Ligand binder design. Structure first.
Ligand code: HEC
Length: 112
């Protein structure tokens, strides 16, 4: 359900995930996360936005990718996100490549 709606919102439609984490991709993701995402997020605590360590357990990859790549579309149209906006309020322009690296880091940290 929520992945299909995330796909319709776009731009990402599908993400096939490796059985194993690509450690080198994740490391680039780590650097990007610490550049861009830590302005508002932490792994274990609430900050400006929700804690993210376990985001890949509660969400799928298309939702996560389109949150990064199309935040306005997600806020306007995705029921999960609309609720979060009500809770956290209203407040970057990554490439898909960058977003996919960050996704890989998010998958790695959930395994920690
Ligand atoms: C502050 C200016 C933010 C920056 C920079 C990033 N995010 Fe964010 N994110 C922020 C908020 C306030 C919220 C809640 C919704 C709202 O607009 O009020 C979010 C939400 C997310 C989510 C959804 C979490 C869930 O449990 O479903 C994800 C996956 C997310 N944010 C990821 C993320 C990443 C990876 C970022 C660096 C590229 C990033 N956000 C930046 C606020 C801000």
């Amino acid at each position: 359900d929520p992945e299909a709606l995330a796909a319709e919102i776009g731009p990402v439609k599908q993400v096939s995930l490796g059985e194993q984490i690509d450690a080198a991709l994740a490391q680039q993701g780590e650097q990007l996360f610490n550049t861009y995402c830590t302005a508002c997020h932490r792994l274990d605590e609430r900050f400006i936005g929700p804690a993210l360590r376990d985001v890949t357990k509660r969400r799928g990859p298309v939702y996560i990718m389109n949150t990064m790549l199309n935040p306005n579309g997600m806020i306007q149209r995705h029921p999960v996100m609309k609720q979060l906006v009500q809770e956290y309020g209203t407040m970057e322009a990554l490439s898909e490549e960058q977003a996919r690296a960050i996704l890989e880091y998010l998958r790695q940290v959930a395994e920690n």
